[PDB]
């Protein structure tokens, strides 16, 4: 049957797409593979019962590939989509799987930090520098000329990084990391990314209580 995906609505705005980066990874995957799908927005503070019946732990995103079940976990979901819709191939080589894997967590720790000298900035910078070296050697995407799964996993997280760190801390990725800047400027301007990203005010609102 028809492909369907449940994703988070923006806080306080039930008919507006939210900022959940795992949801966005899934949506980016469907968009780039040109798969038709229906999107269902879930108010995670007011979940509807029909949703609780198919997602009993309230987990979002969940994906229905037309095979009579709803599955969680954006890793698993994007692999299922890869298997079902092989072209374009978004397979990322295993040796590039962990590229930028610590960026989001380092970002969250630095964002929530209220002590300038606790070392979280240095850690974030170290991970960004690793991304920079990888992109220099193997760019422009994580797997060269063709976009792939690792890009679609990483781009939503870098979007959070840029918007939230600039807003809350007035912090920006250093300009000498030119490959990272080319990377984020390229990814954020893709039609798929513009279509599936949160409005910045909603992303900022989402981070406000956590900060």
CB closer to Ca ion, 125 vs 186:
186
* Residue 20 near residue 85, CB atoms below 8 Å: no
Q: DSSP H helical segments within 47-190, as ranges?
A: 49-54, 74-84, 103-112, 120-138, 149-169, 178-188
CB of 188 to Ca ion, least distance (A): 10
106 is catalytic: no
CB of 120 to Ca ion, least distance (A): 26
User: 179, 140, 185: which is closest to 162 by C-alpha?
Assistant: 185
Q: Mutual orientation of helices 149-169 and 74-84 as an angle, nearest 10°? A: 140
Binding annotation for glutathione: 8, 19, 47, 60, 74, 160, 207
Catalytic residue among 3, 9, 20, 161: 20
CB of 149 to Ca ion, least distance (A): 25
For residue 138, with 0-12 CB atoms within 10 Å meaning exposed, 13-18 middle and 19 or more buried, which class applies? Answer: middle
CB closer to Ca ion, 118 vs 201:
201
Give the footprint of Ca ion on this chain (CB under 5 A).
13, 15-16, 199-200
* Residue 71 near residue 38, CB atoms below 8 Å: no
- Residues acting as catalytic residues: 20
């Amino acid at each position: 049957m028809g492909v369907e995906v449940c994703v988070k609505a923006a806080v306080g705005h039930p008919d507006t797409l939210g900022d959940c980066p795992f949801s966005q990874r899934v949506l980016l995957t469907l968009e780039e593979k040109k798969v038709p799908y229906e999107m269902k927005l879930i108010d995670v503070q007011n979940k509807p019962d029909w949703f609780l019946k198919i997602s009993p732990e309230g987990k979002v995103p969940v994906f229905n590939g037309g095979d009579g079940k709803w599955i969680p976990d954006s890793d698993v979901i994007t692999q299922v989509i890869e298997e079902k819709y092989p072209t374009p191939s978004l397979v990322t080589p295993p040796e590039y799987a962990s590229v930028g894997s610590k960026i989001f967590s380092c970002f969250t720790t630095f964002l929530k930090s209220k002590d300038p000298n606790d070392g979280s900035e240095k850690a974030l910078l170290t991970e960004l520098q690793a991304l920079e070296e990888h992109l220099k050697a193997h760019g422009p995407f994580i797997n060269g000329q063709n976009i792939s799964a690792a890009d679609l996993s990483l781009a939503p997280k870098l979007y959070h990084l840029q918007v939230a760190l600039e807003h809350f801390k007035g912090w920006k990725i250093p300009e000498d990391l030119t490959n990272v800047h080319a990377y984020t400027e390229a990814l954020f301007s893709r039609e798929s990314f513009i279509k599936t990203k949160a409005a910045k005010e909603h992303l900022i609102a989402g981070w406000a209580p956590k900060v």
